[PDB]
Amino acid sequence: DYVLYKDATKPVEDRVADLLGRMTLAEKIGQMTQIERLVATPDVLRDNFIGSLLSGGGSVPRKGATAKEWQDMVDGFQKACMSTRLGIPMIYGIDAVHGQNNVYGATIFPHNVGLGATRDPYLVKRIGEATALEVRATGIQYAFAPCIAVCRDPRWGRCYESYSEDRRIVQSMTELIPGLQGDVPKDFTSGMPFVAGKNKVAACAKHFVGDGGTVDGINENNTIINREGLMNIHMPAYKNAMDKGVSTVMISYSSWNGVKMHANQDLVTGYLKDTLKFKGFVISDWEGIDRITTPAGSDYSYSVKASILAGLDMIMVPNKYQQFISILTGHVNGGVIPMSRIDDAVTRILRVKFTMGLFENPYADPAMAEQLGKQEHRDLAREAARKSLVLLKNGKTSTDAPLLPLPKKAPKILVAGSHADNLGYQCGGWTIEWQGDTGRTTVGTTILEAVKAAVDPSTVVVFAENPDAEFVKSGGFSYAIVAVGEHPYTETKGDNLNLTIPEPGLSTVQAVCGGVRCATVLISGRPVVVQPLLAASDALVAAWLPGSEGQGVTDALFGDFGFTGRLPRTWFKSVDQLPMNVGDAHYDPLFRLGYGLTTNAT
Numbered sequence: 001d002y003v004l005y006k007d008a009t010k011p012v013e014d015r016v017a018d019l020l021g022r023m024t025l026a027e028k029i030g031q032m033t034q035i036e037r038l039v040a041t042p043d044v045l046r047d048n049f050i051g052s053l054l055s056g057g058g059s060v061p062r063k064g065a066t067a068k069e070w071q072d073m074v075d076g077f078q079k080a081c082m083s084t085r086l087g088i089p090m091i092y093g094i095d096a097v098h099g100q101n102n103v104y105g106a107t108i109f110p111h112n113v114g115l116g117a118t119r120d121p122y123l124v125k126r127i128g129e130a131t132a133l134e135v136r137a138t139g140i141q142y143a144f145a146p147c148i149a150v151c152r153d154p155r156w157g158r159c160y161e162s163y164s165e166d167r168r169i170v171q172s173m174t175e176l177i178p179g180l181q182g183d184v185p186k187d188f189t190s191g192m193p194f195v196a197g198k199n200k201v202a203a204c205a206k207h208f209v210g211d212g213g214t215v216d217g218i219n220e221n222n223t224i225i226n227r228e229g230l231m232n233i234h235m236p237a238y239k240n241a242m243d244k245g246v247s248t249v250m251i252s253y254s255s256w257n258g259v260k261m262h263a264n265q266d267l268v269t270g271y272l273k274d275t276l277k278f279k280g281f282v283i284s285d286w287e288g289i290d291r292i293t294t295p296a297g298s299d300y301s302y303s304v305k306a307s308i309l310a311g312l313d314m315i316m317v318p319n320k321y322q323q324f325i326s327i328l329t330g331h332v333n334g335g336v337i338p339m340s341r342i343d344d345a346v347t348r349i350l351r352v353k354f355t356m357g358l359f360e361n362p363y364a365d366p367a368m369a370e371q372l373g374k375q376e377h378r379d380l381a382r383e384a385a386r387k388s389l390v391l392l393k394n395g396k397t398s399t400d401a402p403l404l405p406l407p408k409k410a411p412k413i414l415v416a417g418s419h420a421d422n423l424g425y426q427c428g429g430w431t432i433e434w435q436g437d438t439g440r441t442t443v444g445t446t447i448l449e450a451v452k453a454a455v456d457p458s459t460v461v462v463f464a465e466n467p468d469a470e471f472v473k474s475g476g477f478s479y480a481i482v483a484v485g486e487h488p489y490t491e492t493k494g495d496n497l498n499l500t501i502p503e504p505g506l507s508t509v510q511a512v513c514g515g516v517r518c519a520t521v522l523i524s525g526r527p528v529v530v531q532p533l534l535a536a537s538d539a540l541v542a543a544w545l546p547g548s549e550g551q552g553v554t555d556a557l558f559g560d561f562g563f564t565g566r567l568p569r570t571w572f573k574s575v576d577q578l579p580m581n582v583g584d585a586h587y588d589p590l591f592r593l594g595y596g597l598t599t600n601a602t
């Protein structure tokens, strides 16, 4: 007879109910499982009724794969899932946090902290639009973004994934969501999930909640603060995500007053679902439930019980799916977890899939392949990079002539530094590899390349990664552009207590600047000790992690556009002042939040 859930002209809620009512326990728990592509097989997917797959940092078909290669991979997995008794399409997720960054050739946009310095939510929205297209260009339909954490301690290795230390700024940047999913209708109810269609992707507000508030910025640690600050600082942005229809929400590895988020039923179910009225689905983080216990995974049985009863709907296993499914099944069979919990979880996952049209368009669109790395997207990225630059100094003294903008026509100029010609460094974490990488790992333009592409034909451009003082003094340079900074990092590998840039760095700047007037470009994912660098430089620009379009940097250095970016964080004088955020008690910043020198286009 007629099958309601397969009828596209029917309301989403009716389709969810109809399908849910035909599912076996195995099929229900299957929808709740998300596995890594590395352990997926047509059989595994079909036999276990897997509801979702993901690609972790660096998890790719093969180095340098094309958009078609990705599309074929995703489609392959989808066909297996479509072959099940109910034919429920799987939703493939990935970390497209500053472009479709795992993919070779994808446009790499500036990381969040930089986007916060632009104070342009519309720009960010546009970035989200370009990003969805490039993700769909690879056949993926779900992006684990935006990370709306409010980093309150720069020592956190994920601070660069935070728009600001000021919730107000982070709230405004939730505009990435409508960019990724598309704008919600005017009638729209806050809390409901939404995705315009096959040319958009499901978004993910992460990490619920207070991930940007761990002590000493220690990742995945404990966030000690009253519900007053929790709700005043780290919660706001989520309410905005609810109003903009964010499809999913990922839970943080961190704890709140000693309680693991992945086990906090009060927050996940009591607040996020019951209070905020979130209707989409709640997903876990990579082995998030394993880490509920300590040692991690030392009681997976407990992990499944706590997490599921806490309110999570989909678990990012992402490897031992057999163990996960076996255990969750046992708990249900034993009454430890009620069918209502399972039904609710499956209701939310299906709601999201139906809403985004997954049942209508389960497969990738070849026509979308060209979206990957499309020049327009790169131009957009270029604009964002330019706008994210924060000029901190532009002259050694009040009477010095401002060094920036530099002249495009000069007899001979020096470009130097470890970061002057290193595309990987310039992109930072979450680029090709999980931890990011060094060198030419994808398509883009380094600062050196951008310089050469900007100067007048007559301007001789010399490159020296680490020239000594004499080399500079004898080179007859008119000026020099020196780029230095942090190395790529992600999550815990990024935790840093001293926050000083690696060498050679300061030394190169001092050597170069000692010999000729210099413009130092600082590449970092957060504010770092900068008095020494400042002392030696004539002009110093905070470029954060620009992305693949380095010309965004030269667009400002040479005056095609004036600097407009403003510090989205507090620049400290010393690390032992930390934490220290705007509105604090002893606020004694080297540069207060909102600071930024300007220039006008020549």
Ligand SMILES: *[C@@H]1O[C@H](CO)[C@@H](O[C@@H]2O[C@H](CO)[C@@H](O[C@@H]3O[C@H](CO[C@H]4O[C@H](CO)[C@@H](O)[C@H](O)[C@@H]4O[C@@H]4O[C@H](CO)[C@@H](O)[C@H](O)[C@H]4NC(C)=O)[C@@H](O)[C@H](O)[C@@H]3O)[C@H](O)[C@H]2NC(C)=O)[C@H](O[C@H]2O[C@@H](C)[C@@H](O)[C@@H](O)[C@@H]2O)[C@H]1NC(C)=O
Pocket: 437, 438, 487, 488, 489, 493, 494, 495, 496, 497, 498, 499, 500, 502, 503, 504
């Ligand atoms: C402040 O505290 C942080 C850590 O909390 C410290 O930086 C970390 O230092 C760790 C060791 O002390 C280091 O861990 C080791 O890493 C070795 C390999 O490290 C290279 O490769 C990784 C990526 O694979 C990069 O992230 C590293 O930065 C490093 O990269 C090379 O760095 C050199 C020097 O600038 C450069 O010339 C190379 O071109 C560059 N190559 C690459 C890959 O790009 C590994 O073999 C060890 O087993 C061990 O795991 C950890 O990676 C690093 N954290 C990061 C992400 O930077 C700060 O500074 C230290 O930096 C290291 C590199 C070294 O210079 C130390 O002398 C510095 O103290 C701390 N600052 C201070 C003042 O203590």
Ligand SMILES: *[C@@H]1O[C@H](CO)[C@@H](O[C@@H]2O[C@H](CO)[C@@H](O[C@@H]3O[C@H](CO)[C@@H](O)[C@H](O)[C@@H]3O)[C@H](O)[C@H]2NC(C)=O)[C@H](O)[C@H]1NC(C)=O
Pocket: 218, 220, 221, 222, 254, 255, 258, 294
């Ligand atoms: C926040 O981070 C701190 C680390 O600074 C966590 O505390 C630390 O916990 C680890 C283990 O959980 C302890 O290390 C050692 O682990 C081995 C494991 O085999 C064990 O054999 C040793 O006896 C020892 O426990 C470490 O001592 C401890 N350090 C601190 C800070 O006291 C803390 O648990 C984290 N908070 C949360 C819940 O996120």
Ligand SMILES: *[C@@H]1O[C@H](CO)[C@@H](O)[C@H](O)[C@H]1NC(C)=O
Pocket: 562, 563, 564, 598, 599, 600
């Ligand atoms: C120069 O830049 C400032 C701020 O960046 C701006 O307010 C001002 O209008 C600009 N001047 C001109 C003439 O465009």
Ligand SMILES: *[C@H]1O[C@H](CO)[C@@H](O)[C@H](O)[C@H]1F
Pocket: 055, 056, 057, 095, 144, 206, 285, 286
């Ligand atoms: C855990 O893993 C997921 C998927 O790779 C990331 O999106 C989270 O930020 C990380 F904490």
